[PDB]
Amino acid sequence: LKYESLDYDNSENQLFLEEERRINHFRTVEIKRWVICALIGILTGLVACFIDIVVENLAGLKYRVIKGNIDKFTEKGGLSFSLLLWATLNAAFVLVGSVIVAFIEPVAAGSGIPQIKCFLNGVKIPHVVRLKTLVIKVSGVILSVVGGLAVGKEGPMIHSGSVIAAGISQGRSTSLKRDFKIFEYFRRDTEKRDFVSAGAAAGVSAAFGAPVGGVLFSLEEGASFWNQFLTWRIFFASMISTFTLNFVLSIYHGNMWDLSSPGLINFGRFAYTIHEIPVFIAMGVVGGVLGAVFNALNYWLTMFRIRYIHRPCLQVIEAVLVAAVTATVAFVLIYSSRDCQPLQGGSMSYPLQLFCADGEYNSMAAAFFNTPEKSVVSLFHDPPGSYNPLTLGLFTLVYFFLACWTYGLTVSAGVFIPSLLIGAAWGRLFGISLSYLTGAAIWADPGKYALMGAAAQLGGIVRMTLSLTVIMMEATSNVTYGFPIMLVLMTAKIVGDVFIEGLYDMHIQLQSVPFLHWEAPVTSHSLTAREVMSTPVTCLRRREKVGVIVDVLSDTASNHNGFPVVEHPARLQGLILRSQLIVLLKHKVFVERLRLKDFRDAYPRFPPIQSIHVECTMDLSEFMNPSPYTVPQEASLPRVFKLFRALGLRHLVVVDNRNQVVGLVTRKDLARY
Amino acid sequence: LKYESLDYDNSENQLFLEEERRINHFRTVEIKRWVICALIGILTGLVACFIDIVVENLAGLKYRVIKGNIDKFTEKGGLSFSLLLWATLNAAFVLVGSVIVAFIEPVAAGSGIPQIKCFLNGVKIPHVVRLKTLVIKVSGVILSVVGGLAVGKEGPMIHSGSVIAAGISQGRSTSLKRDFKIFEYFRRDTEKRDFVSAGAAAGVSAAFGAPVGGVLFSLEEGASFWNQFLTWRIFFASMISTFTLNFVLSIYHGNMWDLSSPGLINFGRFAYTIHEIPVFIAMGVVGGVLGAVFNALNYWLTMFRIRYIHRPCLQVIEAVLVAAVTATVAFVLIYSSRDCQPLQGGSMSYPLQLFCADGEYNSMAAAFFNTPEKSVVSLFHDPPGSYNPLTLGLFTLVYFFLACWTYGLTVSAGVFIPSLLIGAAWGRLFGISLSYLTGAAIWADPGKYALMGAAAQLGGIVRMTLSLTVIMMEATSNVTYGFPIMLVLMTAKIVGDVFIEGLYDMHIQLQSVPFLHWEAPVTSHSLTAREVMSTPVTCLRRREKVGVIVDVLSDTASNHNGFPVVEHPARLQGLILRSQLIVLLKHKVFVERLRLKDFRDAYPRFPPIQSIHVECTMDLSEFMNPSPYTVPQEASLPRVFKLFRALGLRHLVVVDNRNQVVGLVTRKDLARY
Amino acid sequence: SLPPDLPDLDPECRELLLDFANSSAELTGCLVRSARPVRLCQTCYPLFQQVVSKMDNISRSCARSLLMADRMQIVVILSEFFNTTWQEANCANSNSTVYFLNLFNHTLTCFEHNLQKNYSEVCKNCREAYKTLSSLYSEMQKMNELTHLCIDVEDAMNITRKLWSRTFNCSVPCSDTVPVIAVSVFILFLPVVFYLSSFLHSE
Amino acid sequence: SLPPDLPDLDPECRELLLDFANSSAELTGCLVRSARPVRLCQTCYPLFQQVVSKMDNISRSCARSLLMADRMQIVVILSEFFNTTWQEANCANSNSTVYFLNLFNHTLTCFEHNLQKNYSEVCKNCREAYKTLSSLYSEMQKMNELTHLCIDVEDAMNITRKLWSRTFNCSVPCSDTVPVIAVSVFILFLPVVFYLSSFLHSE
Ligand SMILES: *[C@@H]1O[C@H](CO)[C@@H](O)[C@H](O)[C@H]1NC(C)=O
Ligand SMILES: *[C@@H]1O[C@H](CO)[C@@H](O)[C@H](O)[C@H]1NC(C)=O
Ligand SMILES: *[C@@H]1O[C@H](CO)[C@@H](O)[C@H](O)[C@H]1NC(C)=O
Ligand SMILES: *[C@@H]1O[C@H](CO)[C@@H](O)[C@H](O)[C@H]1NC(C)=O
Ligand SMILES: *[C@@H]1O[C@H](CO)[C@@H](O)[C@H](O)[C@H]1NC(C)=O
Ligand SMILES: *[C@@H]1O[C@H](CO)[C@@H](O)[C@H](O)[C@H]1NC(C)=O
Ligand SMILES: *[C@@H]1O[C@H](CO)[C@@H](O)[C@H](O)[C@H]1NC(C)=O
Ligand SMILES: *[C@@H]1O[C@H](CO)[C@@H](O)[C@H](O)[C@H]1NC(C)=O
Ligand SMILES: *[C@@H]1O[C@H](CO)[C@@H](O)[C@H](O)[C@H]1NC(C)=O
Ligand SMILES: *[C@@H]1O[C@H](CO)[C@@H](O)[C@H](O)[C@H]1NC(C)=O
Ligand SMILES: *[C@@H]1O[C@H](CO)[C@@H](O)[C@H](O)[C@H]1NC(C)=O
Ligand SMILES: *[C@@H]1O[C@H](CO)[C@@H](O)[C@H](O)[C@H]1NC(C)=O
Ligand SMILES: *[C@@H]1O[C@H](CO)[C@@H](O)[C@H](O)[C@H]1NC(C)=O
Ligand SMILES: *[C@@H]1O[C@H](CO)[C@@H](O)[C@H](O)[C@H]1NC(C)=O
């Protein structure tokens, strides 16, 4: 009763039908869309490089203080006055990073995907698109990753690339200072979702390196009818964002003639036989099961967190304690390591030596001091015999529970990279065991199994099949490996769906969003589409009076947003909705003049009727759409549901045999099943 | 009046609604579709390797006879008795390859794409899916490529992979010997197009190496509403076909642990700056212009060929003369070459030495004796200073006119590879000229320009934007090069659309197929959808008599396939079509019993009413669909067109204000604009 | 007063390293000596075996302390380099090679036996001395087909091919130009008859 | 009776090839001689210059006829191999290196000066002889930071690090175990207080 829907249909009036005749009389309305879809990718690539340049310099400031601190509190007295320093340095950043979220607005909490695949679906979640949400999210993921927590940074690139999509498309900046008289004709919906679709497919490419995966993502959620031109602009807006991220970072590092580092995460360059095709299936089942342990007990945690810690004073303290425990467990676990190795190459960014021979370096200080992306790349590409298999066990068994207990906090970060790292960890740990029981001549290289454990763990945690196979095929730069990965993610969904739901679906169902999804249940195939409606209809005839429509709008007991018009007993001659109706009452159009643009004024927000103080009659023709998408009764629900979803509809209307309105099907009726 | 449409809507009856209740009472109807989509890819990979194994052995038999012939008619008398031998060897194969097409059926002529992107569209072209067409096409492309003509082999893989899609989906083999009682419930349309879409996206991947390009191809033509499950089976049927082509050819060549050669054409492995981004745009305009010369004078040829050579006796002779001239021009052009080079590596498959020093070999005999794919790969990857720029000029200026004069013949081969070869030829010839006027330090390597001329020439000849950018990105195995290629193909369409239409569109318009395409013209935006209909409607009331429906079916002056039912003046209570109606008249259902399966019998072909010899009345309830997709009048054409196309509709019905049928919109009405 | 092995090695292994040194310096010297005429394959075949033998002997302790002592394992690098140079030259040698060498020596003596501008001299006599040599060369490629076959044979045939063409103008006359113009202009004449005759059959 | 250059070269260039031969054989001999202790960088620095000089002299006709005569250009390969071995060793040398060598010589003499099991001997005296050496080594990596720095220095420090640890048990005692247990078990005790205290504040 709080989340009102999104109108994707253009309610053509006589005013729209006259204004589109006016603008058509040198066809300069579509060439103005390519400019927005061009500079909607440049502005996303620059945000994606502004995060990456800042966070590595702040991490380089933060970790060298610590490794210079425990090079002098060795050889002498205690180390505890450095453990306290690393605990308070991991607490001081996340204190600010949790205060600026838990008090100003809670919408920026978590990742950005479940609040953006519901808007894409048609549900306007409160706030979300406001600039303040962008400023607090892009300054909350910098301050939390360097804060020291087990959270990825490639999560919040989708939401941050979607907010700037629906902010420059309007040309308004509704805070203050209207900043343009340009970019009218776009101040409506049916453009809002068409540019949020081009924004969210410019954050998936700019964070993973896959442009052709981003369009499949934005299509997968955006289940509209297929039009080539719109996809041919989403592809053009996606291809820019992985070019204005190479061209800035390559200016930053060195020479401009080296166009590597295609995104924020970079898998390397990258041979198998048929005889191990069952073995990969035997990984995917494991990828379901541990996934359904990660995705279940978090649920038993999250309702606890929603039951007792539902106030801003406590969750800040709880985030600080999560950061301090994340420091102390890592320091205990590197204090007691016995496995030390000689350094080589750039496999250790900050080499740490304590309680080890001279020249050699501790190997447990790897995968805590360096970034998660560098550790995941090192797990894909290291030559065999490089990891002690007791190190990976105590690392995975700690990092799994830390990444489970950290997600759902009131800070702003994602959950992609703390799934790939767990998956590659136990994938390489499983790949070693196929070498200590055979000779391991050629076909037991752990670089394959470290890949196909990381592909399994994502499908186990985040059920996502078509748009994830492609972005695992494009970032690996190899099309021969496309066939086992598809065979893994197909398994890890249909094993994991037996136990528990998705991770992105619990955080939608636990907020009571309607969220109708593609297709309909086959068990409910014969509902015959007369049971699924609201039986009385508070419709309004055309041109009665004014007091009728005032008393049908101003009513506390019911909130209805769409009203069909009738004639003579009824005819269903089109429908009028609240926005247009209170626009007509804000002016005086009583029959006792204006163009299309007047309706657009104050478009984002419409004043409530209690501020519209103060009979005659008004003629509702030339303000309504003369042809709603109607369906009869007697029709199957699968057909009714497909029609409703496949187009973008807020108000389906059912009729009688003699064309009389007998019910109205809205979104919340179809969502309940 | 010959090409009747395809029904994609399931006309739910009471019999369908009872039978789907019967089959649902362990959900074994969808798990039977994954078996067909699995073994629809294996059977396409085996055809794609059966072509490739046979054609290289026959070419190896044919060319070594010739190079052994002109090693003994050197050093002695004349060479003309070998020119006659190479002319008659290029004539003897194409004689049989043109006789088995020009006499049995003309549908296998040309490529396979314009007869399969019209079926995909909904037009049942005559024949086409019959086994005989498959047998003559897959044995006509072998006999023509080795015959010696400038035609590609990766063209006819789409049609040959689409015929076996709609032949094992039925389980009938309607020639004789029904061969199964399995695979009922699929003997209807709404499965026919769903498996032709999975077949045609298994020929694009099996011929180029791009699985994710094939699904975008089959979607681009298949403009239906988006459902995730169907795309998630088309992707699964596409990924198989590039794995059962590696696994067979790698058994054939050598060891099975080398999974290269991903398809029939294999680009290699594969650095640019911003400062040459305009230069690539300056290629694409050229790629339009020469494209619009290739795509225009062929038109002036083809109507000539349709005006005077429209009989099977002459076009066989004309194909033989094209083959003999293709021999003789190549022999004259290699007889007079002066440029000879020392051999190295495997750059020459069959080395030819005539009138050259000992050890060195003629370089003009390259790119005539070896395959086009090997020459295109050699033009992408050779180091600089390897081609004499007079050789490429006389090669391109001959091969352009030969590939223009050969296309449109009555043989069965494609036009992809004779576009990439021309594009790479003048691309490398343009890339040399940027080295003989600068120093050419790093950024003037001809390997880039030989790529982005070949990408330009396809967009110039075959206007195809979204499904071609992806298959040029996946076969090059590099995602950094995705941005200039998109910037080239975008130019070469909007320069070439000024002059002349597509190449695949002239061979649709010159056969008068309706072929409505996605979207509607913006100049005709206000037609108001009452002008675009047939004004009188020969509808039929329910339960009159028998003589009424017999005299409304049996009529020479008009052929109508769908009839709406009325009641009382009219009500539009659903519609009945001819197939069901003559099924009911083939039995005796007059009101004076059967399941759903009876309608399916003799599904492919329905007997005409003149064989249904010989009142009472029949009740048309429980045989019609009770809810057609209706629209009112007063509605804009863009809305009407989108609804018609986006779903699959054969009979849209317009109504009145009081729900009275006043017109019927069919496909040929919308197609004329 | 004795660290065991880390600063210095025993005097039981140092003479082995000096023996490998004496082998490798002389192998590089003989290998380097062959100039434009390549006789390395046929002159450094005996002392190439000994270096390999010495390497095997060292490989067969005194193998961990002597080639796993450091990065830049210089003994393994020199040995590896020799192995790489040897394989790409691809000697595989010897009777056939000897016969070819004898033929080359004979073939080459007939040039200065008949030498003395005016290279139109009695060199027709060397024609049957030349061609069969090249014929044997092609036959030798049929013998080592189931890539370059050697380096002594390749350079020996290369020198003869350089002498036969670009310093002695020994070209062959051509006899056929008018038949390969007549047949070509006859075959390129049938389409302009065919289309024009099918056009005028409209009555 | 004289082919110009193809079978044989002039006697004006063959002595240059013999001089390069005499250089390269002796360079390989000296380079090969260094064993586990690596003194190659500090012993083959003079005769490495001459080989390069000779190569430049040959490079500066008698350059097309002598290294573009055939495939397997063996002079270019030997020279290239030497260049590759030289660059990866990365000598770049000399005063600092000399000082380091002197320190190493001094540091190592104190071991057998105090030698004589029972490695718990007066080696505390060499502690201040040891540590500053390693300190200088770290400072030297700060000097050549703006990768391995040399091979004489790396192996000389490697030998001392091998002697200091795994044949002389010279470990350092540890003092702190109870504070890094107390602080850790105190910090891992606050969440089980926090959640349980927030649960019992429901009244
Ligand atoms: C090298 O070997 C030769 C021949 O056996 C011998 O005369 C000479 O003394 C040896 N020199 C060295 C340095 O071992
Ligand atoms: C190996 O070295 C030993 C000791 O110098 C020598 O006695 C023996 O002949 C050598 N054998 C070979 C095969 O070189
Ligand atoms: C140090 O000596 C050890 C002993 O084998 C060797 O493995 C290592 O490569 C040496 N390190 C350096 C820097 O030379
Ligand atoms: C070269 O190395 C290969 C592979 O290890 C070995 O088989 C061969 O015997 C070596 N040859 C020489 C000349 O050392
Ligand atoms: C070389 O020896 C082989 C094997 O005995 C023999 O087959 C061949 O005829 C010999 N060739 C010559 C040139 O003597
Ligand atoms: C060539 O033949 C001559 C004369 O018989 C002989 O002196 C010389 O050694 C031979 N040379 C070769 C390379 O066989
Ligand atoms: C070339 O030599 C031949 C044979 O000795 C002689 O007849 C002729 O005059 C010579 N020609 C020239 C141009 O010296
Ligand atoms: C090599 O050089 C040395 C020292 O100059 C000289 O004594 C010797 O004669 C030279 N040997 C050769 C083969 O040139
Ligand atoms: C180059 O070679 C010449 C001739 O042998 C000799 O005179 C000169 O000293 C050499 N110069 C150098 C730099 O080696
Ligand atoms: C033949 O000699 C020429 C002259 O330079 C050289 O370019 C070529 O590599 C040689 N070929 C062979 C097979 O040795
Ligand atoms: C090695 O080759 C490089 C690059 O050509 C050159 O700059 C350098 O002088 C060479 N060094 C030696 C020792 O030859
Ligand atoms: C080596 O010489 C440099 C440059 O003159 C000087 O800066 C440095 O102090 C010297 N070092 C030693 C160890 O003498
Ligand atoms: C080490 O010092 C000793 C005694 O002064 C001296 O004899 C010897 O040459 C020195 N060695 C090195 C390598 O500096
Ligand atoms: C070790 O040497 C010390 C000092 O000479 C002596 O006091 C002690 O008894 C020795 N211990 C052993 C176990 O030999």
DSSP code string of A64-116: HHHHHHTTTSSSSS-SHHHHHHHHHHHHHHHHHHHHHHHTT-GGGSS-SSTTT
Asked whether the beta carbons of D32 and D26 are under 8 A apart, the reply is no
Are C84 and C111 part of one and the same domain?
A: no
Are A328 and A226 part of one and the same domain?
A: no
- Asked if the structure places residue C197 within a domain, the reply is no
Ligand 2 binding site (Cβ under 6 Å of any ligand atom): C 53-54, 57
Asked whether the beta carbons of B664 and B651 are under 8 A apart, the reply is yes
Domain end position, chosen among C56, C89, C122:
C89
Joined tokens for residue A21: 């005749």
Strand runs labelled E in A327-443:
340-342, 360-362
**Nearest C-alpha of chain B: how many angstroms from A477?**
6
Distance C23 CA to ligand 1 centre (A): 9
Distance D25 CA to ligand 1 centre (A): 14
Closest by CA to B296, choosing from B493, B496, B509, is B496
Residues β-bridged to residue B663: B654
A482, B525: Cβ pair inside 8 Å? no
Residues β-bridged to residue B577: B562
What residues of D are in contact with residue A75 (Cβ under 8 Å)?
172
- CB burial of D7-27 (b: ≥16 within 10 Å; e: otherwise) equals bebeeebeeebeebbebbbbb
Are A328 and A446 part of one and the same domain?
A: yes
Are A281 and A218 part of one and the same domain?
A: no
Are B213 and B289 part of one and the same domain?
A: no
Per DSSP, the residues of chain C read ---SSSSS--TTTHHHHHHHHHHHHHHHHHHHH--SS--HHHHSSHHHHHHHHHHHHHH---SHHHHSSSSS-HHHHHHHHHHHHHHHHT----HHHHHHHHHHHHHHHHHHHS------SGGGGGHHHHHHHHHHHHHHHHHS------SHHHHHHHHHHHHHHTTS--PPP---SSHHHHHHHHHTTHHHHHHHHHHS---
**Alpha carbon distance D111, A191 (integer Å):** 82
Q: What are phi and psi of C30, to 5 degrees?
A: -70, -35
Contact with chain C for residue B80, Cβ under 8 A: yes
Tell how strand B630-631 and strand B652-654 pair up: parallel
**Alpha carbon distance B45, B203 (integer Å):** 8
- Asked if the structure places residue A600 within a domain, the reply is yes
DSSP structure class, residue B5: B
Asked whether the beta carbons of A457 and A422 are under 8 A apart, the reply is yes
- Asked if the structure places residue B404 within a domain, the reply is yes
D187, A75: Cβ pair inside 8 Å? no
Using CA atoms, how far residue A440 sits from A423, A491, B203, C45, in Å, is 22, 26, 37, 38
Using CA atoms, how far residue C141 sits from B420, C96, C158, in Å, is 36, 12, 15
Domain end position, chosen among C89, C118, C139:
C89
- Asked if the structure places residue D136 within a domain, the reply is yes
Per DSSP, the residues of A441-491 read -STT-HHHHTHHHHHHHHHHHS---HHHHHHHHHTTT-STTHHHHHHHHHH
- Asked if the structure places residue A18 within a domain, the reply is no
Are A89 and A139 part of one and the same domain?
A: yes
Residue with CA at minimum distance from ligand 4 atom 5: C83
Residues β-bridged to residue A575: A564, A625
User: Distance from CA of residue A436 to its chain's centroid?
Assistant: 41
Closest by CA to B381, choosing from B296, B465, B440, B454, is B454
Are B197 and B93 part of one and the same domain?
A: yes
For B130: left if phi > 0, alpha if psi spans -120 to 50, otherwise beta; the answer is beta
**Alpha carbon distance B658, A517 (integer Å):** 35
**Nearest C-alpha of chain C: how many angstroms from D194?**
55
For residue C84, which atom of ligand 4 is closest to its CA?
Answer: 1
- Asked if the structure places residue D130 within a domain, the reply is yes
Using CA atoms, how far residue B506 sits from B499, B503, B510, in Å, is 13, 6, 6
* Structural Rg of chain A based on CA atoms: 28
What single-letter amino acid sits at A74? Answer: T
**What was the elucidation method?**
cryo-EM
**Helices vs. strands in chain B: H and E counts, helices first:** 28, 7
Ligand lying closest to the C-alpha of residue A344: 3
DSSP H helical segments within A534-575, as ranges? Answer: 547-553
> CATH code at A642?
3.10.580.10
**Alpha carbon distance B287, B395 (integer Å):** 18
User: Distance from CA of residue A321 to its chain's centroid?
Assistant: 27
Asked whether the beta carbons of A206 and A156 are under 8 A apart, the reply is no
Ligand lying closest to the C-alpha of residue D16: 9
What single-letter amino acid sits at D93? Answer: N
The maximal CA–CA distance of chain A, rounded, in angstroms, is 97
Q: Which of D158, D160, D166 to mutate to test the pocket of ligand 3 (most atoms within 8 A of CB)?
A: D158
Using CA atoms, how far residue A636 sits from B12, B13, B538, B575, in Å, is 9, 11, 28, 16
**Alpha carbon distance B93, A363 (integer Å):** 69
For A188: left if phi > 0, alpha if psi spans -120 to 50, otherwise beta; the answer is beta
Are A90 and A238 part of one and the same domain?
A: yes
Asked whether the beta carbons of A115 and A128 are under 8 A apart, the reply is yes
Domain carrying residue B572: 547-671
Joined tokens for residue A179: 């900043």
**Nearest C-alpha of chain B: how many angstroms from C97?**
20
- Angle between helices A211-221 and A466-474 in degrees, nearest 10: 170
Asked whether the beta carbons of A174 and A140 are under 8 A apart, the reply is no
Q: What are phi and psi of D90, to 5 degrees?
A: 60, 60
- Asked if the structure places residue A16 within a domain, the reply is no
Using CA atoms, how far residue C188 sits from A276, B323, B325, C194, in Å, is 59, 11, 6, 11
Are C83 and C108 part of one and the same domain?
A: no
**Alpha carbon distance B230, B176 (integer Å):** 31
**Nearest C-alpha of chain B: how many angstroms from C133?**
12
Q: Count Cβ atoms below 10 Å from residue B224 Cβ, excluding itself.
A: 18
**Alpha carbon distance A407, A532 (integer Å):** 38
Q: What are phi and psi of B501, to 5 degrees?
A: -85, -170
Residue with CA at minimum distance from ligand 12 atom 13: D96
Residue with CA at minimum distance from ligand 3 atom 7: C70
The residues, ordered by sequence, that sit 6+ positions from D120 with a Cβ below 8 Å of its Cβ are none
Contact with chain A for residue B635, Cβ under 8 A: yes
Contact with chain C for residue B580, Cβ under 8 A: no
Three-state secondary structure call for residue D102: helix
With tokens 């020439």, the residue in question is: B457
> CATH code at A89?
1.10.3080.10
Q: Count Cβ atoms below 10 Å from residue D108 Cβ, excluding itself.
A: 20
Report whether B362 belongs to an annotated binding site. Answer: no
Three-state secondary structure call for residue A52: helix
Per DSSP, the residues of A611-641 read GS--------TTSSBS---EE-SS--HHHHH
Residue with CA at minimum distance from ligand 13 atom 6: D105
- This PDB structure is determined at a resolution in Å of 3.7
Are B226 and B288 part of one and the same domain?
A: no
Joined tokens for residue A555: 């009513």
Are A215 and A337 part of one and the same domain?
A: no
Helix (H) or strand (E) holding D66: helix D64-67
Q: Count Cβ atoms below 10 Å from residue D43 Cβ, excluding itself.
A: 14
Residues β-bridged to residue B4: none
Asked whether the beta carbons of A188 and A603 are under 8 A apart, the reply is yes
Are A184 and A76 part of one and the same domain?
A: yes
**Alpha carbon distance B134, B215 (integer Å):** 23
- Asked if the structure places residue D67 within a domain, the reply is yes
- Asked if the structure places residue C182 within a domain, the reply is no
Q: Count Cβ atoms below 10 Å from residue A171 Cβ, excluding itself.
A: 16
**Alpha carbon distance A218, A220 (integer Å):** 6
With tokens 């019992």, the residue in question is: D200
Joined tokens for residue B71: 């090693």
For chain A, the domain total comes to 3
Are B202 and B152 part of one and the same domain?
A: yes
Q: What are phi and psi of A563, to 5 degrees?
A: -130, 125
- Asked if the structure places residue C77 within a domain, the reply is yes
Q: Go through chain B and tell me how many residues it has.
A: 673
**Is residue C116 within 6 Å of ligand 7 at its C-beta?**
no
User: Distance from CA of residue C109 to its chain's centroid?
Assistant: 22
- Angle between helices A211-221 and A192-200 in degrees, nearest 10: 140
**Alpha carbon distance A97, A91 (integer Å):** 10
Tell how strand A652-654 and strand B652-654 pair up: unpaired
Joined tokens for residue B339: 């440029």
The residues, ordered by sequence, that sit 6+ positions from B498 with a Cβ below 8 Å of its Cβ are none
Distance B359 CA to ligand 10 centre (A): 10
Using CA atoms, how far residue A399 sits from A403, A422, B449, in Å, is 6, 8, 49
- Asked if the structure places residue B516 within a domain, the reply is no
Joined tokens for residue A83: 């453990």
Are C79 and C102 part of one and the same domain?
A: no
Residues β-bridged to residue B575: B564, B625
- Asked if the structure places residue D79 within a domain, the reply is yes
For A77: left if phi > 0, alpha if psi spans -120 to 50, otherwise beta; the answer is beta
Contact with chain B for residue A478, Cβ under 8 A: yes
Domain end position, chosen among D24, D55, D89:
D89
Per DSSP, the residues of B394-455 read HHHHHHHHHHHHHTTSSS--BSSHHHHHHHHHHHHHHHHHTTSSS---STT-HHHHTHHHHH
For chain C, the domain total comes to 2
Domain carrying residue C82: 14-89
Asked whether the beta carbons of A163 and A133 are under 8 A apart, the reply is yes
Asked whether the beta carbons of B354 and B70 are under 8 A apart, the reply is yes
DSSP structure class, residue B250: H
Helix (H) or strand (E) holding B665: strand B663-665
Residues β-bridged to residue A447: none
Three-state secondary structure call for residue B564: strand
Asked whether the beta carbons of A174 and A126 are under 8 A apart, the reply is no
**Alpha carbon distance B485, B280 (integer Å):** 9
Joined tokens for residue B587: 């039995």
Output the CA torsion B178→B183→B185→B187 (10° steps).
-40
Helix (H) or strand (E) holding B63: helix B33-69
User: Distance from CA of residue B617 to its chain's centroid?
Assistant: 48
Joined tokens for residue A423: 């998956």
**Alpha carbon distance B392, B396 (integer Å):** 6
Are A189 and A313 part of one and the same domain?
A: no
Output the CA torsion B115→B118→B124→B128 (10° steps).
20
Contact with chain A for residue D186, Cβ under 8 A: no
Joined tokens for residue A40: 């909607």
**Alpha carbon distance A350, A362 (integer Å):** 11
- Angle between helices D74-89 and D14-33 in degrees, nearest 10: 30
Distance from the first to the final alpha carbon of chain B: 17
What residues of A are in contact with residue D166 (Cβ under 8 Å)?
357
**Alpha carbon distance C122, C116 (integer Å):** 9
- The dihedral of CA B502, B508, B510, B515: what is its sign? negative
Are C85 and C20 part of one and the same domain?
A: yes
Joined tokens for residue B432: 């040399």
